[PDB]
């Protein structure tokens, strides 16, 4: 069991109806708060571990927005070493409805060290997700 990774929060700017449910609500430790993106499609969020830092990801945990769990199905998690994700690989694809109000934990088996990781939400989701966590270890 590896430590929770920290980094700078990156992703889609803004929030639905400018209420303020920005990407940062997915990293605040509260499963009742959530990211509600300004648009239906294209929303994403993640971390930049910082220049020169690469982690190997061994687990991802996430919790859907309460009452909108189906807006995660089809979302994917990617690791990359370019901030535009053009070199990304998909670490996990959500294909089952995530349980409400808890962190679903998924193992990742990819030995690559990444500087960047994200959740890329499916169309019609407004990026909805309540909490997102990555675990792993410094690439050796
Ligand atoms: O469409 C993104 C939006 O979906 C839900 O709100 C949908 C609509 O709900 C209606 O009943 C009205 O209240 C209207 O304001 C909305 O267009 C989510 O509740 C909302 O957070 C957002 O994710
Ligand atoms: Ca939250």
Domains of the chain, CATH where assigned = 1-140 (2.60.120.260)
Helix, strand or coil, per DSSP, at residue 72? helix
Final resolution, Å: 1.7
Query: Quick one: which ligand is closest to 124's CA?
Result: 1
Does the C-beta of 131 come closer than 6 Å to ligand 1? no
Query: What stretch of H or E contains 55?
Result: strand 55-63
Q: How far apart are CA 30 and CA 78, in angstroms?
A: 23
CA distance 78 to 101: 23
Q: Is 36 in the pocket of ligand 1 (CB under 6 A)?
A: yes
Which secondary structure element, helix H or strand E, spans residue 8, and what is its range? strand 8-11
Q: Which atom of ligand 1 is nearest to the CA of 128?
A: 23
Alpha-carbon span 9 to 45, nearest angstrom: 7
């Amino acid at each position: 069991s590896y430590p929770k990774l920290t980094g700078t929060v990156i992703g889609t700017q803004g929030s639905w109806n400018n209420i303020g449910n920005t990407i940062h609500k997915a990293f605040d430790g509260d499963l009742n708060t959530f990211f509600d993106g300004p648009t239906a499609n294209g929303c994403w969020l993640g971390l930049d571990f910082g220049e020169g830092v690469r982690n190997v990801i061994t687990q991802i945990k996430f919790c859907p927005r309460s009452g909108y769990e189906q807006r995660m199905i089809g979302g994917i998690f990617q690791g990359a070493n370019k901030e535009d994700f053009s070199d990304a690989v998909t670490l996990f694809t959500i294909t089952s409805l995530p349980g409400s109000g808890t962190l679903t934990s998924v193992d990742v088996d990819n030995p690559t060290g990444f500087r960047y990781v994200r959740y890329l939400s499916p169309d019609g989701s407004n990026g909805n997700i309540a909490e997102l966590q990555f675990f792993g270890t410094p690439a050796g």
